[PDB]
Amino acid sequence: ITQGLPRVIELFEARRPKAKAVISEIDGVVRIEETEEKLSVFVESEGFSKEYKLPKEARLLVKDGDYVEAGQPLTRGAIDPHQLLEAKGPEAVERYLVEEIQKV
């Protein structure tokens, strides 16, 4: 994560954060799949399937069987503003940038 001026610069430059969070591209229900060595999270829609293979030590913000919005974070960390843009649209990005800059 990042605090202070570097976080501000990272936001104003719209950089992809180093320790970025993972977000859902679509809406759907959470289905966790965890081997003792490997980890993956599945966003299952009524007719679609999404699969996010994340490193095994990543903190989750999603309880199993939850309905997540497109663009909603699954992992902790800073959100990549461009991914948030493609997933959720302009308004969500403006909101995110303003609030995130204001936190500092």
Curated annotation (Swiss-Prot):
Chain segments annotated as coiled-coil in the UniProt record: none
Top-level taxon in the UniProt lineage: Bacteria
Family the entry assigns: Belongs to the RNA polymerase beta' chain family.
Subunit and interaction comment: The RNAP catalytic core consists of 2 alpha, 1 beta, 1 beta' and 1 omega subunit. When a sigma factor is associated with the core the holoenzyme is formed, which can initiate transcription.
Function: DNA-dependent RNA polymerase catalyzes the transcription of DNA into RNA using the four ribonucleoside triphosphates as substrates.
Name by which UniProt lists this protein: DNA-directed RNA polymerase subunit beta'
Organism: Thermus thermophilus (strain ATCC 27634 / DSM 579 / HB8)
Gene name for this UniProt entry: rpoC
Range of the intact protein held here: 1252 to 1355 of 1524
